[PDB]
């Protein structure tokens, strides 16, 4: 490679060069909860 690495300075050129809520509650499950 003779030149420094660089990103494509004209990236636009590549275009041309190819081709609600679940209401269920379980109180028993909630009471097994410790505040």
């Amino acid at each position: 490679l003779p030149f420094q690495t660089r990103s494509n300075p004209i990236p636009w050129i590549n275009t041309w060069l190819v081709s609600q809520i679940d209401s269920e509650v379980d109180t028993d499950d909630l009471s097994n909860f410790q505040l």
Partner: protein, 734 residues
Amino acid sequence: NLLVTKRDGSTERINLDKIHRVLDWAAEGLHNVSISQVELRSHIQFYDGIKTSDIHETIIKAAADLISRDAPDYQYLAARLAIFHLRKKAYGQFEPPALYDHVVKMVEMGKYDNHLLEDYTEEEFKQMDTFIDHDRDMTFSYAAVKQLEGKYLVQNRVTGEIYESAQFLYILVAACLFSNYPRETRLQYVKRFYDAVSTFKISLPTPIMSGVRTPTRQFSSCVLIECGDSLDSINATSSAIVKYVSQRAGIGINAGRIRALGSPIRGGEAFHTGCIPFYKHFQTAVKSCSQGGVRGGAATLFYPMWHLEVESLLVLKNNRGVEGNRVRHMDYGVQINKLMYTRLLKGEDITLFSPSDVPGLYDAFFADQEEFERLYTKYEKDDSIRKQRVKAVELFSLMMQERASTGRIYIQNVDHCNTHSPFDPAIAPVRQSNLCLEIALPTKPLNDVNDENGEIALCTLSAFNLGAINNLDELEELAILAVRALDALLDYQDYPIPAAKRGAMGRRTLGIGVINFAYYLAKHGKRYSDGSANNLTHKTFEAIQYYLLKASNELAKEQGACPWFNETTYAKGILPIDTYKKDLDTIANEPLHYDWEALRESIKTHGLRNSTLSALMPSETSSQISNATNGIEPPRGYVSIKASKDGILRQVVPDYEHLHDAYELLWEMPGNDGYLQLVGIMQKFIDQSISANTNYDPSRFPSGKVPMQQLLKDLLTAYKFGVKTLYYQNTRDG
């Protein structure tokens, strides 16, 4: 052949090399950017006489829209163009003038407060100009500059004329805050505070950023007003809202005392029309004025869950129903205590009362949890008291249903706000919160606009940039600068409502939080959801609170504790590490690393200059200046889309190239338990509250609908770990 219009009005031939050069300058040193791409994506259409300023604004938008994951350095290309544009608007050239020459011209125009020229000599202004490094404008991101030009830089809200640049804003915030310091140390504090905010060690709120140096002195972000059950109090509350909204403040209203619809007035001379007609009056008060010309006024209204009208108040934000029973443009916080949650867990009922029919129940609801249960159960037995029974499951379902739809129905755990607070509930209970549910301060209702007996709570804010510190011991110096700056601010500013000055001078309440917490976790290789940051959060927020209290304690030795320090639990020798909810020991075992016992004795002896110090605000706007992730929230994406005056803003996460794998994005989290655990750990040390969010992705649940079971379980999990408040509920749009 064709002509352009220069900034001075003159015209000359079009020369595209001028556009090439300005773009070449802005892209110097940046990676993966293209001058060519910016010019072509500008779609700039030249007409004879085209304004050169319209040309420049067009290419700023073009470069701003190229901000992406593949080319993040456009955040700096667009900013440099925008900084350059703002220089010309304010100065007519790129190089800023001398600091003294600028202040002189601005005081004559009435854009600065004339006290700057009285408290500082020309030799001192020229000495502060050597502190300024104008190259620090080249460290902003594009989102940062758009917030500066849209909200913070002193400007004409009718003309659109910008008058200053970013470094003059910073240096004059430092000058004004320490303007009343002794000349032995004044310029030293001015330089260090300038360095702290211009290198993004400390974040300043919107009213401080946009206000401190202007003739109108109101810089407290949060105003908490309590409303009593009388027309004299409702008028006083309404007048205080109008005054503080017009001067940069966001409001928190406590209207839970107002009796229910149908209650007797004067023994039956009149029929009480209900809360909703008074809530509508509060809403037009908030919306009557702009927030200091910067943005619109907002407010959150608070009422207890057991209020008789709670089923009518919970549905005020949904868009179905008539205008008579809807108050949509205000947010609401439902106040809950342990007894309410217990009725839910046991599947029992909740009795609704009008606060006028239950003597002492309202005051006990906050101050005394045992006295509340005594009065509450007693009044349920009494059949002569007007009441209404609702199944606790149905009431909690109605609240969370409206919380999920609007996202603006908030929760405040009033028992947590009083068992783990810097205030004694017998003397100065906490009965409400603020707009964003991070402020918890005592209030007393007013009977007149100028009532000396009422108390309105003000809170001044700031934030530590967790992404700018390399050692937790750097917080010691930053806490000194932040606390000293905010405490000097309380004496510096004016107070439009006498009841508001009473609380501020009495308690001197501060609210200092954090920003860049998500970026902080990425640098340590931790995540929100898995609990890997629990011990790190404990060690981090211990240092924050310790160095904050130590800074306010040293200031109390120097200038005396706040007048009402005797009303704090700090005065009784009680620290937050004593009153935190003990279930936090089951999710973090990190031991305390700082000498809290030496501070406890020092606080007993010398007190605190401020009654409160720490509060984690969301910092939706202010955190964008340092390109930080806002508050404690995880970013929505590597490139986030945020709102602004001009339109959309793209914000890249800090250090995207090296840490894109380390971040845990908002919707990459399995649930809320991990985040809520971190919030609980933070709350162990935070004086006030935290703007804690809950987030839900419908696609993460069977049949694509979020279960009420999970909504309630996360709500109970928040209470289990001592979370005082719940802010936004974000529901994903996919």
